[PDB]
Structure formats: structure tokens, C-alpha cells
Design an enzyme around this catalytic site. Structure first.
Site, PDB file in Angstrom:
ATOM      1  N   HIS A   1      16.605   2.650  68.553  1.00 26.12           N
ATOM      2  CA  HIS A   1      17.169   1.458  67.923  1.00 26.12           C
ATOM      3  C   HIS A   1      16.278   0.223  68.066  1.00 26.12           C
ATOM      4  O   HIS A   1      16.731  -0.907  67.887  1.00 26.12           O
ATOM      5  CB  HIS A   1      18.586   1.192  68.436  1.00 26.12           C
ATOM      6  CG  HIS A   1      19.446   2.418  68.471  1.00 26.12           C
ATOM      7  ND1 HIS A   1      20.117   2.898  67.368  1.00 26.12           N
ATOM      8  CD2 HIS A   1      19.725   3.276  69.482  1.00 26.12           C
ATOM      9  CE1 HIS A   1      20.780   3.993  67.700  1.00 26.12           C
ATOM     10  NE2 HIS A   1      20.559   4.244  68.978  1.00 26.12           N
TER      11      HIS A   1
ATOM     12  N   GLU B   1      22.715  -0.468  73.967  1.00 26.48           N
ATOM     13  CA  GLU B   1      21.821   0.685  74.037  1.00 26.48           C
ATOM     14  C   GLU B   1      20.355   0.315  73.829  1.00 26.48           C
ATOM     15  O   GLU B   1      19.483   0.759  74.580  1.00 26.48           O
ATOM     16  CB  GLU B   1      22.245   1.727  72.994  1.00 26.48           C
ATOM     17  CG  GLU B   1      21.479   3.036  73.000  1.00 26.48           C
ATOM     18  CD  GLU B   1      21.825   3.898  71.798  1.00 26.48           C
ATOM     19  OE1 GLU B   1      22.746   3.518  71.041  1.00 26.48           O
ATOM     20  OE2 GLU B   1      21.174   4.949  71.598  1.00 26.48           O
TER      21      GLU B   1
ATOM     22  N   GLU C   1      18.897  11.859  75.690  1.00 29.28           N
ATOM     23  CA  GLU C   1      20.053  11.003  75.876  1.00 29.28           C
ATOM     24  C   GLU C   1      20.269  10.944  77.376  1.00 29.28           C
ATOM     25  O   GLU C   1      20.641  11.937  77.994  1.00 29.28           O
ATOM     26  CB  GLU C   1      21.278  11.585  75.175  1.00 29.28           C
ATOM     27  CG  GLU C   1      21.188  11.585  73.659  1.00 29.28           C
ATOM     28  CD  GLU C   1      21.828  10.358  73.051  1.00 29.28           C
ATOM     29  OE1 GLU C   1      21.497  10.005  71.895  1.00 29.28           O
ATOM     30  OE2 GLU C   1      22.672   9.752  73.739  1.00 29.28           O
TER      31      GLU C   1
HETATM   32 ZN   LIG Z   1      20.763   6.062  69.972  1.00 28.49          ZN
END
Ligand SMILES: [Zn+2]
Length: 185
Positions: free
Chosen positions: A12, A21, A148
Site C-alpha cells: 500500500h 497497515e 502477511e
Molecule cells: Zn495489504
């Protein structure tokens, strides 16, 4: 492994406290970058501040022809789910995805686990997830995984993420994974 090249992609969602995030991934990516530079490894970032959409990130990565591409994300899952999963392209669209990228995924999972980062209890299997739906992995022509690091909605993961010490922890685990894969190359 000095002189090798690694492309770092800070992705992002957010923690319940509102720690985003994009900032978690940015900061952790910077710590990983510092560790790698310390190892003599040549690094690059997908972005220069806290950006590109998935295609220019694919073109950048491919253009740099790295030994390894590591993308950093955090999940927005149900609160009780916590832990990391390592995503890799499966089935493979080329020979790099079929081999080197999978080895990279396994080594990264092992090292994240050995460094105190718990494997996800809610997704994938043993901290790994082979999948066909992610454009960023599918289009990669050099070894590439997408990590992640945890679930931002989980109190424990979020507690690690909103803390500088936790972010450094994550970075140490990532650098052990990356260095680990680079040495096999
Ligand atoms: Zn993401």
C-alpha cells in the site's frame, strides 16, 4: 551473499487503535532494509515515502532482476485469528515460481517461526499459502513471496505492530528468512 539484490515492497487495513497497515509495512520494511544493507545486500523499495499500483511494482521488480522480492502486508481478519502466513504463487506460471519462490516461501516460514513470530492459526497451512489469485506474485519473474506478518485486528499482533520493539522483531525474522534464501542461491 553480499552484492546480491533484494526488492522490498511495503504494501500500500488497520489496528483497532487506528495504526495503519501502510505505516507498519513501511517502517518494518525500512528496518529490514537497514539489516540487509548491514549484510552487504543491495536493496530497493517499491515506494519512497509513506504510491505505485500493482503493475509498476511488478515492472520495477522485474526491471531490477532481484535475487529475491519480498512484499510486506498485514491482514484485517476476524479478531481471534493471529499469526503470519507466507503467500506464494501456485500453480506456477513459470519456472522461478515453481521452484525458487517456493523454497523462498518455506525458508521464510521456518525463519519467521524460529524467531518467535507465530504461524497464522486461521489461514493457510503451517504458515504457508499457495494461491492463484494475487497479481503481484503471478506476474513475478524472479523469486517472490508476500508475507502477511499478522492480523491487525488481533490484540496480540496489533500489540507487536504498534510497538517499535515488535516491528524490529518482525524485521529480524524477515532478515533471517531473506538471508537464508539468498545463501541457497
Ligand atoms: Zn495489504
Amino acid at each position: 551473499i553480499a552484492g546480491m539484490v533484494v526488492f522490498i515492497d511495503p504494501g500500500h487495513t488497520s489496528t483497532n487503535s487506528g495504526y495503519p497497515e501502510h505505516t507498519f509495512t513501511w517502517e518494518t520494511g525500512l528496518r529490514l532494509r537497514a539489516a540487509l544493507n548491514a549484510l552487504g545486500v543491495r536493496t530497493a523499495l517499491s515506494r519512497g515515502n509513506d504510491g505505485p499500483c500493482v503493475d509498476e511494482r511488478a515492472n520495477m521488480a522485474n526491471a531490477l532482476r532481484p535475487n529475491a522480492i519480498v512484499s510486506l502486508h498485514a491482514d484485517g481478519g476476524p479478531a481471534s485469528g493471529r499469526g503470519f502466513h507466507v503467500n506464494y504463487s501456485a500453480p506456477p506460471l513459470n519456472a522461478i515460481q515453481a521452484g525458487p519462490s517456493v523454497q523462498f516461501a518455506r525458508i521464510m516460514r521456518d525463519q519467521l517461526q524460529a524467531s518467535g513470530i507465530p504461524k497464522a492459526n486461521y489461514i493457510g497451512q503451517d504458515g504457508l499459502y499457495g494461491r492463484s489469485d494475487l497479481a503481484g506474485l503471478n506476474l513475478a519473474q524472479y523469486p517472490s513471496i508476500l508475507v502477511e506478518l499478522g492480523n491487525m485486528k488481533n490484540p496480540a499482533d496489533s500489540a507487536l505492530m504498534e510497538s517499535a520493539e515488535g516491528r524490529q522483531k518482525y524485521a529480524n525474522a524477515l532478515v533471517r528468512g531473506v538471508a537464508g534464501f539468498l545463501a541457497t542461491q
